[PDB]
Amino acid sequence: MNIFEMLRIDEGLRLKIYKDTEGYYTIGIGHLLTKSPSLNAAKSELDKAIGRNTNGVITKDEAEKLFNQDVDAAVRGILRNAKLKPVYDSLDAVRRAALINMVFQMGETGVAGFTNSLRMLQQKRWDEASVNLAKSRWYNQTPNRAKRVITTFRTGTWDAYK
């Protein structure tokens, strides 16, 4: 298992514009297009992202390309973040993937907001971090995905994904 496989399980793959769990226009493997309610504004972002007139539909290759860019961006965002970097550097490979997943889902700012959990992860207090991570809108809104990520932080294994 690796970060790509992990995120592919959590996000799924859809080749036509769809609405994410928050009601936002998305496509591919969890690629947010816009927070605007307009489908036209989403098709326009889509065409710009892909470099062609897509009419709201993309191919598997195009989906995978956006995905590669997005994972790369998440990692680079973590490495540039004064709050996230130190946590990422302190973790083992498996748990680093857990942190990337959260950043991919809610963005760098959002995760940097989990101040107390970040501190607990850095201190390697797995059980305690797991409890604190669950006290969040994230956990209440997407509980199955949150549990998978949280178990990954708790155990340092890919068990929730196998």
**At its nearest, how many Å lie between Cl ion and the CB of residue 76?**
14
**At its nearest, how many Å lie between Cl ion and the CB of residue 119?**
26
Backbone angles phi, psi at 27, to 5 degrees: -150, 160
**At its nearest, how many Å lie between Cl ion and the CB of residue 46?**
9
The reply to whether 20 belongs to the active site is yes
Nearer to Cl ion, 42 or 87 (CB): 42
Tokens of 122: 């850095």
Q: Which residues bind Cl ion (CB under 5 A)?
A: 49, 142, 144-145
Residue 38 annotated as binding site: no
DSSP string covering the chain, please? --HHHHHHHHH--EEEEEE-TTS-EEEETTEEEESSS-HHHHHHHHHHHHTS--TTB--HHHHHHHHHHHHHHHHHHHHH-TTTHHHHHHS-HHHHHHHHHHHHHHHHHHHHT-HHHHHHHHTT-HHHHHHHHTSSHHHHHSHHHHHHHHHHHHHSSSGGG-
Nearer to Cl ion, 114 or 138 (CB): 138
**At its nearest, how many Å lie between Cl ion and the CB of residue 146?**
7
The reply to whether 47 belongs to the active site is no
Q: Is 67 exposed, middle or buried (0-12, 13-18, 19+ CB in 10 A)?
A: buried
Residue 104 annotated as binding site: yes
Nearer to Cl ion, 87 or 111 (CB): 111
Nearer to Cl ion, 19 or 85 (CB): 19
Residue 117 annotated as binding site: yes
Show binding-site residues: 32, 104, 117, 132
Residues designated as active site: 11, 20
Show binding-site residues for substrate: 32, 104, 117, 132
